[PDB]
Design a protein around this ligand. Structure first.
Ligand SMILES: [Mg+2]
Ligand SMILES: [Zn+2]
Ligand SMILES: [Zn+2]
Lengths: 1166, 89, 76, 99, 52, 49
């Protein structure tokens, strides 16, 4: 078969240096003139930056001169002025060139930090630049006389040496010099010689640089790049429409800055050719060559020399490098964003009538958005003759079009998105419901996922177009299909505020109320008792209920009974579906309980019942909260009667200690601590006064004189239910508020005695103001820090995707309850839930396997483990996965919005990064910066040091700035000796044995140490436990999984120790390496297999290494990446997410995982 | 309307390949080559296809098989037409 | 030594050259006259340089050229 | 605001309001990530190819949309297409390999 | 640069007026079908003369 | 702006977050109505045509 020549669907991409002949291959003509357009007739001046002949026709299928105007003549080259008449679009495509007079350095390869021309020649940068500027002479191929090959000479020196040796010696200067150097260079010979020199001399200094350079050279040879190409003989010109002259209003013109630059280049070039033909003196033509160099540099990348300025405008002109780089840090237009058709946005409102699967979409918006569908559906049914008439109709908004819109809307989902998109739930698919209004209506239960208030936040709509997009939106991005946070299995659909105040008010009980003590047949006549005004919503009552238990085999058992409950609970029970026990609704129904109701319902009945359940819960919560008549008055906030007395006594203490400071019994600072302590104690007392009084003070009589229960006061119910408010804010309302602190952080010893229910005076308010402003500032800052962090995270993860099914390794980490210092800061059940078992586990007695090797532990399995006393389970993790270049689903876990095991092909790196990132706004060394420090693996300020090796140790030498520690292993050799500065107080016992990784001092320790001296499981455990300490201290739920995948990405690279295939000390992929030593253990060499050492790379560091260069050019410094890749002739195969996002094809994950896989196997095959 | 796709996800495991298969069948309906295997409620081809997945009468196996048959069904017709191209010799 | 900014590596490079004395200008100009006249005389000593001019004037009066494309005029 | 098919920017072909008929919404990096977490490839592809950046894709799309055929024949986004020239405008040769 | 100091620059707002709108492109595609059917209407010779 | 009779109480979740639920009495009385004044322009230019 003939493979192909012309257009196919391409794979990979290649980048390298460009030959002059190559640059010519692209060029369809040489632009010889600085002229742009004719100045009256605006036609392009022929062979100029804007040209019809070289580039293309000005208007569609029309010759410039005007002779051939017909769409027939096409491949015709006009005789008058040759222009092939073709679409004007080809003026957006065709390149050009300029043949420079003198050679020119390409500023990218001269000024890139590791100067390419420089280190290829082993020639220092400043020397090379000194040569290019004609500031000195440099030797080339010196032969055998007096002189080194790379040696530089001055005027007089060159003269003398020339007088001595006429021939068999050579020296040039300028660009031609460097080009001659590069051309003369033989890489292979240098290779041989350097291998030898590497071998002969033993010094670290010598062979380090030696090996680095030889590797560099041989890489450059293998590239296919010849050094000469770093010096430009020919300069390509960019297509005109990519740097347009296009006219504006007022007859004014506007053009790209590349025109000024290209113009300058052409000018000085032609003038140089002229100066050559005029036989000018050296001092002139040299100046001209230099100026040409500067012009070219300014064109390519401006700012590495002089930063030339555009005509009449101070602001420096944008060069091609600046064209590529973009702005806003690193953003390549697939990054910062891209404008998109079929979209819209507006202010959002509530819409409680909605089912959770839908959203209100404004009429006009739907019309405009679905306009093309409407056009097609209108003439398909034949209501409109032609598409034109269809437009006329929808523009007239004729009566018949609304029905057609209702047709095209029905099964067609739409995507809704909010401004701060963090986790994947930031975008959710809904079924559109036509609404009269300009506002978008969004289901209340979703408001938590978007973090969307109703205070004027806006949402954007996007219309999924292709069939695949509709089905993706419906089966993936659909609201009902994500009920659970991907971070943790807990429901994100949890009722928010009004609803929970409703369910809370519903099931609650007062002491005495209408219908107290009576009995009812069932929930029906309970509700009937309530709605008729006979019985009160909350009263202690026995009613018969019928509950169910699915506890049979897949089967629902029925049981009936007389339960002691209230009227409200009885009414509410009507909603609860099937197999749930009445136990769940018989409580007070707080936010937590009202959430666990949903959770249990989902882990029992399945998805659909849970969906409709949540819906009904919302409806009833709203309705009954509305009926309840909850409100807030000024008298709802109750101040303690004892407040003033507490204030007075605590105010007596301060005058006590003040008297002592006057008499000098106590020091000023000690005094300060004392007074601050008494005032703090005061605040605690007032708070714990107002809390008792607010909470229990309802004193009410049933048939006797008195009884007291939890208060029915509004603000209390609100704070208690979890609807809104909290003990702190309520404390600020009634009790006194806090003690403030100056910006310094020195806490003021005269606290705010007054509260918000009372007035604050001038000073108090002024002092509160700082707290406010710093609050807004800090929060608004932590948003940015969160974003930056997530960014680093997806950058370090991204392409990690579930790929294989099961690697099948027994490997994994030991999962224990966290058990910190007190009782159980987090159980075992949460840590092991949804995680696969590495191996079978035991009862206290054995040959009884409860959980059999690798099995997803769901709620039932975890409860079965809980029945038994088992404290310990070994669990497979993403960090331990044997699979290379990805994670097997069997290792990951089940976690998702769905309880089933993770699908094959879902991209986990991204969702992990997101899951870690989203809560980051809620985090307060400790803190979010501590989190960053952890993920960056930064060695702390005052780190500890761990024993290098086990065995008895002792102290040696003296006081040089380090008092040396000598370790003595039992069997093995002693010589390990570390230099410990003695000015730091030690721990380690001079007479005792210390295990490797023991405490030889105090303070935090760098995870590099934990990785080396303790090992991979130990280091991953340290990272996960510390970061989880940070999050969990703030009340943030994040599964260990995501952190573990980030960790896996951190340790991706490692350094080799032994040899037999590749180089000694190289940092490299443990995927590559392990797949190589697994392959080397058999066949090949019988075993030559090398030993490596696992390395720890920070997230920002590990992100640096990416196979794909297109990917790297996105988030890294673009200018460097492009060069560094171009010299190696690096070939990007795509294969990742970011790269395929940039190039604009299907993501090698998700739905596209079926595509890229089917193509991946076709590649490197028959 | 299909409020939840979970059942279809039960019928084919992947849930991505669900989107793919359902899309394929959906196009078998939308471009008019074929007709529904189950009553159309005014549900668009998008949802009809998913209903077809839930009923278990449509998946990758069935589709591949049917297409493979239709290939030979066209080969049957064009048999006498293309064998007449013996002028190639 | 070199600040770059090529205005400087020019300004300094030309600034080495010393200004001419009023007599030096005439010395140099005299040298110019010497050289040129040498090439002119060397042209006058070539037979084909003569014969060609002759043929060209035979072409001028034959209307195959113009008097402006051969001579700029003589002395006169 | 709402937009179906509006005007387009000249330098890079992208949706732009010229009539005060608004340019579409900006789909950013984070939104792309959100699309990446879900398994939706086609939604993303159409998002950054046919619905926006593809000069061929958008029209070939619109015609299918009115024809009652939901599909996409994506082609290559014009941003990357331009970037290729911008890279090639320098001394760098960037090519598309194989088949 | 225009306002906000942001990446909004003058050239970003220059709209291509030389592009034909898809709203019209569809009608250019439809007109062909219409005139084709209508040209199927006339006698085969009249059709040839009008198409010519 | 304008002062008005206001009641604090959840009403059928239509006030859900900060949301405001307003009687028809207000939109009828035309009190919260606003008058906008826009300046539109038409420019007669010179084109080479
Ligand atoms: Mg807000
Ligand atoms: Zn012409
Ligand atoms: Zn694995």
């Amino acid at each position: 078969l003939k493979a192909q020549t012309k257009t196919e669907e391409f794979d990979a991409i290649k980048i390298a240096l460009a030959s002059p002949d190559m640059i010519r291959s692209w060029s369809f003509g040489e632009v010889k003139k600085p002229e742009t357009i004719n100045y009256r007739t605006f036609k392009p001046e022929r062979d100029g930056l804007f040209c019809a002949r070289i580039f293309g026709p000005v208007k569609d299928y029309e010759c410039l001169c005007g002779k051939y105007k017909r769409l027939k003549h096409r491949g015709v080259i006009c005789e008058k002025c040759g222009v092939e008449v073709t679409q004007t679009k080809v003026r957006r495509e065709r390149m050009g060139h300029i043949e420079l007079a003198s050679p020119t350095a390409h500023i990218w390869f001269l000024k890139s930090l590791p100067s390419r021309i420089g280190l290829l020649l082993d020639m220092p940068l400043r020397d090379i630049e000194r040569v290019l500027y004609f500031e000195s002479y440099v030797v080339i191929e010196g032969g055998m006389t007096n002189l080194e090959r790379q040696q530089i000479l001055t005027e007089e020196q060159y003269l003398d040496a020339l007088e001595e040796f006429g021939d068999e010696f050579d020296a040039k200067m300028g660009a031609e010099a460097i080009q001659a150097l590069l051309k003369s260079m033989d890489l292979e010979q240098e290779c041989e010689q350097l291998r030898e020199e590497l071998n002969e001399t033993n010094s670290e200094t010598k062979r380090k640089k030696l090996t680095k350079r030889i590797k560099l050279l041989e890489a450059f040879v293998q590239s296919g790049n010849k050094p000469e190409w770093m010096i430009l003989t020919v300069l390509p010109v960019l297509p005109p429409d990519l740097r347009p002259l296009v006219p504006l209003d007022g007859g004014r013109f506007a053009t790209s800055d590349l025109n000024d630059l290209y113009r300058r280049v052409i000018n000085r070039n032609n003038r140089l050719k002229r100066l050559l033909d005029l036989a000018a003196p050296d001092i002139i033509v040299r100046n001209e060559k230099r100026m040409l160099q500067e012009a070219v540099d300014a064109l390519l990348d401006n700012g590495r020399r002089g930063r030339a300025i555009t005509g009449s405008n101070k602001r420096p002109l944008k060069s091609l490098a600046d064209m590529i780089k973009g702005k806003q840090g690193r953003f390549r237009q697939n990054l910062l964003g891209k404008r998109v058709d079929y979209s819209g946005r507006s202010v959002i409102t509530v819409g409680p009538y909605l089912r959770l699967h839908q959203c209100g979409l404004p009429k006009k918006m739907a019309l405009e958005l679905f306009k093309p569908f409407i056009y097609g559906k209108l003439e398909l049914r034949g209501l409109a003759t032609t598409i034109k008439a269809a437009k006329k109709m929808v523009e007239r908004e004729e009566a018949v079009v609304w029905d057609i819109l209702d047709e095209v809307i029905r099964e067609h989902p739409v995507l809704l998105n909010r401004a701060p998109t963090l986790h994947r739930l930031g975008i959710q698919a809904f079924e559109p419901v036509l609404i009269e209004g300009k506002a978008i209506q969004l289901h209340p239960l979703v408001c938590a996922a978007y973090n969307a208030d109703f205070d004027g936040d806006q949402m954007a709509v996007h219309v999924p177009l292709t069939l695949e997009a509709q089905l993706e939106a419906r089966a993936l991005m659909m609201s009902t299909n994500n009920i659970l946070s991907p971070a943790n299995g807990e429901p994100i659909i949890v009722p928010s505020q009004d609803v929970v105040l409703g369910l809370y008010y519903m099931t609650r009980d007062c002491v005495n109320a209408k219908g107290e003590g009576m009995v009812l047949t069932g929930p029906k006549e309970a509700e009937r008792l309530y709605r008729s005004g006979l019985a009160s919503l909350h009263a202690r009552v026995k009613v018969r209920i019928t509950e169910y238990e699915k506890d049979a085999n897949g089967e629902l058992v029925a049981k009936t009974s007389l339960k002691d409950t209230t009227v409200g609970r009885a009414i509410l029970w009507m909603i609860v579906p099937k197999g749930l026990p009445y136990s769940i609704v018989n409580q007070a129904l707080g936010k937590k309980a009202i959430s666990k109701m949903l959770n249990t319902c989902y882990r029992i009945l399945g998805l659909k019942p849970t969906v409709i359940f949540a819906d009904q819960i919302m409806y009833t919560g709203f309705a009954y909260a509305a009926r309840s008549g909850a409100s807030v008055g000024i008298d709802d906030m109750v101040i303690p009667e004892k407040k003033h007395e507490i204030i007075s006594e605590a105010e007596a203490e301060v005058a006590e200690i003040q008297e002592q400071f006057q008499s000098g019994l106590v020091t000023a600072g000690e005094r300060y601590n004392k007074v601050i302590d008494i005032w703090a104690a005061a605040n605690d007392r007032v708070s714990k006064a107002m809390m008792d009084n607010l909470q229990t003070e309802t004193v009410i009589n049933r048939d006797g004189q008195e009884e007291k229960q939890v208060s029915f006061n509004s603000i209390y119910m609100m704070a208690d239910s979890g609807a809104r408010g909290s003990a702190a804010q309520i404390r600020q309302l009634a009790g006194m508020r806090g003690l403030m602190a100056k910006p310094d952080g020195s806490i003021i010893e005269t606290p705010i005695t007054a509260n918000f229910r009372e007035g604050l005076n001038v000073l108090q308010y002024f002092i509160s103001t700082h707290g406010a402003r710093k609050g807004l500032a800090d929060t608004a800052l932590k948003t940015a820090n969160s974003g930056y962090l997530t960014r680093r995270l997806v950058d370090v993860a991204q392409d990690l995707v579930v790929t294989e099914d099961d690697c099948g390794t027994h490997e994994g980490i030991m999962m224990t309850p966290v058990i910190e210092g007190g009782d159980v800061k987090e159980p075992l059940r949460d840590r092991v839930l949804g995680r696969v078992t590495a191996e079978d586990v035991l009862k206290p007695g054995t040959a009884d396997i409860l959980v059999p090797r690798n099995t997803l532990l769901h709620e039932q399995w975890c409860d079965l483990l809980e029945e038994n006393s088992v404290d310990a389970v070994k669990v497979r993790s993403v960090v331990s996965c044997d699979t290379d270049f990805g994670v097997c689903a069997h290792c990951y876990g089940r976690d998702l919005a769905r309880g089933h095991i993770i699908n094959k092909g879902e991209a986990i790196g991204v969702i992990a990064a997101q899951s870690i990132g989203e809560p980051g706004t809620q985090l307060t060394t400790g803190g979010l910066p501590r989190v960053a420090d952890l993920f960056e693996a930064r060695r702390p300020k005052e780190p500890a040091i761990l024993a290098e090796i086990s065995g008895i140790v002792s102290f040696g030498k003296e006081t040089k700035g380090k008092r040396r520690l000598v370790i003595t292993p039992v069997d093995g050799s002693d010589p390990y000796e570390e230099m410990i500065p003695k000015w730091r107080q030690l721990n380690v016992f001079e007479g005792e044995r210390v295990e490797r990784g023991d405490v030889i001092s105090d303070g935090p320790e760098a995870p590099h140490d934990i990785l080396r001296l303790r090992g991979v499981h130990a280091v991953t455990r340290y990272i996960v436990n510390e970061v989880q300490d940070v999050y969990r201290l703030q009340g943030v739920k994040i599964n260990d999984k995501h952190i573990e995948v980030i960790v896996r990405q951190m340790l991706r690279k490692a350094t080799i120790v032994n040899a037999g295939s590749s180089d000694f000390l190289e940092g490299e992929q443990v995927e590559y390496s392990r797949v190589k030593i697994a392959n080397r253990e058999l066949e090949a060499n019988g075993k030559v297999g090398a030993t490596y050492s696992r390395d720890l790379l920070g997230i920002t560091k590990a992100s640096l290494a990416t196979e794909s260069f297109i990917s790297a050019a996105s988030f890294q410094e673009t200018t460097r990446v492009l060069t560094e890749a171009a010299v190696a002739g690096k070939r990007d195969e795509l294969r990742g997410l970011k790269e395929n996002v940039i190039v604009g094809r299907l993501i090698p994950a998700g739905t596209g995982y079926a595509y890229h896989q089917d193509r991946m196997r076709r590649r490197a095959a028959g | 309307a299909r409020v939840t796709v979970q059942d279809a996800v039960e019928k084919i495991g992947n849930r991505f390949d669900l989107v793919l298969v359902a899309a394929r069948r959906a196009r078998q309906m939308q471009v008019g080559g074929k007709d529904p295997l189950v009553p159309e409620e005014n549900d668009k081809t998008t949802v009809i296809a998913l209903r077809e997945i839930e009923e278990g009468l449509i998946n990758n196996q069935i589709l591949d098989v049917r297409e493979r048959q239709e290939q030979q069904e066209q080969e049957a017709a064009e048999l006498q037409a293309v064998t007449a191209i013996a002028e190639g010799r | 030594g070199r600040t770059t900014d090529p205005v400087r590596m020019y300004m300094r490079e030309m600034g080495t050259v010393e200004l001419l004395t009023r007599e030096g200008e005439i010395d140099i100009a005299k040298r110019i006259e010497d050289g040129i006249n040498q090439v002119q005389c060397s042209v006058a000593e070539y037979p084909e340089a003569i014969t060609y001019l002759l043929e060209q004037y035979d072409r001028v009066e034959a209307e195959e050229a113009r008097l402006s494309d051969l001579i700029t005029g003589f002395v006169d | 605001h709402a937009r179906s098919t509006g005007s387009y920017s000249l330098v890079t072909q992208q949706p732009l309001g010229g009539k005060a008929q608004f340019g579409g919404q900006r789909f950013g990096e984070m939104e792309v990530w959100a699309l990446e977490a879900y398994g939706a490839a086609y939604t993303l592809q159409e998002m950054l190819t046919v619905k926006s950046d593809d000069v061929n894709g958008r029209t070939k799309m619109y015609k299918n949309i009115v024809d009652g055929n939901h599909q996409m024949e994506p082609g290559m986004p014009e941003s990357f297409n331009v970037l290729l020239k911008e890279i090639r405008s320098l001394g760098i040769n960037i090519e598309l390999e194989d088949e | 640069p225009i306002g906000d100091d942001e990446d909004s620059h003058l050239g970003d707002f220059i709209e291509d007026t030389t592009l034909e709108l898809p709203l019209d492109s569809a009608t250019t595609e439809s007109l062909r079908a219409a005139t084709h059917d209508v040209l199927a209407g006339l006698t085969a010779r009249e059709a040839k003369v009008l198409r010519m | 702006g304008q002062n008005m009779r206001v009641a604090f109480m959840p009403w059928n979740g239509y006030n859900f977050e900060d949301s405001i639920l307003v009687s028809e009495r207000v939109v009828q009385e035309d009190r919260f109505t606003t008058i906008h004044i826009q300046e539109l322009a038409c420019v007669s230019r010179d084109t080479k045509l």
